[PDB]
């Protein structure tokens, strides 16, 4: 019972938080894109950048 409840709680919390992050990423996307223009994340920095 408790693990089933945790399963639901997990899916609720995850969905809420992911929606927060994707939304924020939209507004910031212009900022984010320019940041990527400047410099890059370590893997894709090392090859791609």
């Amino acid at each position: 019972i408790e693990m089933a409840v945790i399963y639901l709680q997990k899916l609720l919390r995850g969905r809420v938080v992911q929606n927060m992050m994707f939304e924020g990423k939209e507004k910031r996307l212009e900022l984010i894109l320019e940041l990527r223009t400047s410099h890059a994340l370590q893997e894709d920095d090392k090859l791609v950048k």
Partner: protein, 179 residues
């Protein structure tokens, strides 16, 4: 030489001159309004001073209120406001210029900005660009080539600063844009 001249004029006035210091707290921990007494830190010693009134010229900045109003806009802000070298913001419909503005890092010239140049030359060329959207008598013009996106083009309109100085001197200084 001129700085030394001004400093000697300040000596003859008896103005109280402090290099190196940094602003420790007026009214320390006591209620700040009004100020009455002030402290200054230094490389070696405490300072205290008596301050009926306090005038700031510490740092120019974008206004906090307007900075926030921009960040609400989600116009790209990198501590100063981001444009291409043809004044486009991230909105095709919104464009910006003057020392509040700065170019993408790709230009690799975060030292070089509209802050560097004359004001008038900036406004004049910005208007010339924006007229091309408005004016039917010149032909309508394309969006920039990326080849322009490669560079900040060298303006030349000299930048003026000028002042009257302690002991009733006049002062005038003009510059080529530079780091």
């Amino acid at each position: 030489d001129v700085e030394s001249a001004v400093e000697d004029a300040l000596s003859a006035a008896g103005v109280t001159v402090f290099h190196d210091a940094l602003l420790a707290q007026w009214n320390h921990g006591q209620h700040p309004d009004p100020i009455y007494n002030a402290c200054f830190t230094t490389s070696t010693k405490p300072i205290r001073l008596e301050c009926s009134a306090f005038f700031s010229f510490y740092k120019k900045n974008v206004d906090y209120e307007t900075f926030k109003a921009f960040n609400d806009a989600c116009l790209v802000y990198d501590g100063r406001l981001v444009i291409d070298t043809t004044f486009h913001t991230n909105d095709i419909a919104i464009r910006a210029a003057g020392s509040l503005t700065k170019f993408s890092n790709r230009y690799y010239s975060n030292e070089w900005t509209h802050s560097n140049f004359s004001s008038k030359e900036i406004g004049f060329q910005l208007a010339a660009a924006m007229l091309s959207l408005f004016d039917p008598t010149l032909e309508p013009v394309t969006e920039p080539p990326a080849d322009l996106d490669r560079l900040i083009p060298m303006y030349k309109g000299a930048k003026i600063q000028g002042g009257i100085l302690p002991g009733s001197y006049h002062y005038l200084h003009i510059s080529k844009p530079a780091i």
